[PDB]
Amino acid sequence: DRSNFKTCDESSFCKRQRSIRPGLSPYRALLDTLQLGPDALTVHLIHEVTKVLLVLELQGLQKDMTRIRIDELEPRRPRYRVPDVLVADPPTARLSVSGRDDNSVELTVAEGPYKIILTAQPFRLDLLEDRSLLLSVNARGLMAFEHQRAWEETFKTHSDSKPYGPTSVGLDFSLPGMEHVYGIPEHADSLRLKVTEGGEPYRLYNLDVFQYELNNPMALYGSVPVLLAHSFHRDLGIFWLNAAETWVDISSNTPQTDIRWMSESGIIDVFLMLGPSVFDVFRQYASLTGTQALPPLFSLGYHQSRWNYRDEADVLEVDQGFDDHNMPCDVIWLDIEHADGKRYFTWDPTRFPQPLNMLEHLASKRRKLVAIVDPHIKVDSGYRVHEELRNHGLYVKTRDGSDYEGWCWPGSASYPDFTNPRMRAWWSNMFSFDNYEGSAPNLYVWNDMNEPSVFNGPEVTMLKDAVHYGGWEHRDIHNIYGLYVHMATADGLIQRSGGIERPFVLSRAFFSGSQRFGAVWTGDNTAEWDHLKISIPMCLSLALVGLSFCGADVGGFFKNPEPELLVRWYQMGAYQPFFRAHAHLDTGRREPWLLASQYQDAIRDALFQRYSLLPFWYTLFYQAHKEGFPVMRPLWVQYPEDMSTFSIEDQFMLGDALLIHPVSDAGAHGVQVYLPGQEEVWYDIQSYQKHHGPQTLYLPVTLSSIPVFQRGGTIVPRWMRVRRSSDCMKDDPITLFVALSPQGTAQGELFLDDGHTFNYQTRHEFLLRRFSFSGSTLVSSSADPKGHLETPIWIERVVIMGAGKPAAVVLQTKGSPESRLSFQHDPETSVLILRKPGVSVASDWSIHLR
């Protein structure tokens, strides 16, 4: 089982690094070599025993960040520096020497308040805001930098020639006052990260783990080397920009958390993101690696998938099944059995002979299709893709110069070198409608197995000593191989349209920056209740590090879920960003209408709730795209001073407005919902019952229950006319749900555009509306005047929670006479429904309750 994968003791560089224990560091800074440059401070470091000379490059950056880079002064060969992950060269701030002694130099970033104290012996860095110590570097003396010398290592039957010998780097960080750290996905583990003292470090190495288990630090399919630290008082982030195999130790100790990163090769390159709030950290990290790509609206709908739908007739029966059972669905997925023997970009000539016709039928239902395209290419001289890549030398190579060959789904297969920009350009051009024969504008793509998975490779992946573009070793680039696949596919979908259509690409492997290219999911989970539960902490850990478009297979990939579990997973999935049902080849069919009526009805209700909330989902993703704020959020992000939220992972927020506690236990009769916030009220969106915070509420549940609460002070837009797909709905009127604060106020936003193009950016064709309630007046105004949109969308209804009965309701909009609205009021629930305002969503207007 797990003997297939290295523990830290079996990873020779991790064993060496981790044997260095906290103590007096042998490194010291040579203050005579210190130079203050235009962008950076450089100073030489030296190992006291080996006399090896390193160069520290220290930079203050705009937006309250610090960058630390350490490399060899005179290396025999260049070390790897991670490309294509940073979206720009980060703007710097000026450093000044503002203090110095014989063993210390104090530096000021710009004109304050941030300062960096460089200690010479032993080498050390302290980061301060005024006189408050924020963070220390190498305080435990764990810095380790194996220089390149003038080795051979075997695991199971695979031998790493390791021609450059030991080159691993490592460094420790101390976080005074921090007891809670988060991030570094992907692990099937709790949201709040555990100390690693008595066990394994957390491992970051994109790996394909068959039937992975829960509550363990084994590396899974993706790696985002970003750690967030939260306390009552401050938020910090650490971004370790290294693409090699990386291990992370976490230890606690007046409260303080120490973090240690250990990577196989490359330079030391770390960003310190100083907050002070968690939203400052979100902004800081987004300025470095970018923001969530704005998904086309259809991709926020429901996806129906399995391994595998049999043929074109099966796909069309599934499509018709949704309409015959009145369930919405936007996309049906085609797994690997749709191709000719797992030759990607092809179609099985018997079961998919007319793909354009199938796609046309789906388009007539205003639905899409997703086809899988993996990055392993069958070694087959009749396969044009293989022949082109072979002839143009675009494959990953071995040390003897031959193309690397491993084993995957089509048998023997080679692996394109996606680190090569010429290879990525070839890949993108292959998605043209002339090259990818049988594709059409409503066909989108799923990249799987892009760790890369190699069935006969060490740890089921590529050999460390395979050779990539520019002579870099596979051990140097491993964790960005999948990102490059994701990136090139997404660019292919953009290019095939002439640069107009937004892409949709789901990817299994990922790295920092993958949020720019589409969605991810947590791989091959299992149809069990604890796998349902763990989807929240896994997608929350991804949300915190910028990957907002996350989900888990609804129903579980492996095994057959009992119907009650499948209902609960639909309810859970309906309130998570990427919403796809998927299943293993040997499972029973579980399209949602194959269940008994009581289970069908609960699932249909969950699908209707999701489709009604699409305007809300779309606006949260627009805010993620513009600001870098996560869509799905831990409670502690919204309540940073409520220490009882710091570990919660059976509950989450969507934006700031909705709190979700899905039922995740068989036979449950109720749930305990923690409603946070001093002076805060929460509305049960099914009963409209208002609840004051903070409290733990016992809420009885039935099979149809999805515990959802809207926060007082928020306005949530909904499409109350659920149709068969999102395309059918995107011209429909909006219903506004206004949840009044105790002060009688509320606010919200709404983003609208054509739903699938870049016209919002290239032509400013979009709407961003601000809705605000205060006193007794609801006002719609523009939150961005640059955006204009031709749209028939109008406001058909306003639902106000927590309001008394007015005497009259008066609407004013520019260009129209003052109008009277009829209304309905429930004295028991204090719910006020305003009938048919009838005003365009593009117009300024106000409604007054008299």
């Binding site: 109350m720 006319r721 149709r723 068969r724 011209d731 009938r835």
Partner: protein
Amino acid sequence: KPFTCLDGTATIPFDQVNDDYCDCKDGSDEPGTAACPNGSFHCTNTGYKPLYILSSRVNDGVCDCCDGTDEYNSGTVCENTCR
């Protein structure tokens, strides 16, 4: 004269029949629009069998009636296929 919902839940002026807002709990005030969640739209289908469709499929861009009358203001032009 006013219109009365077939379930007696309300009585509204006939200017609220097919006014693209749902006023009757049974959906009976909007037989020709997509406004009510429980409504139905009648395909006359001269030349085939008459059909009832969900109100949510009125002007959804998809051709549901063979005579094409469910799509009258959606940008989709449906051809007659009752043959």
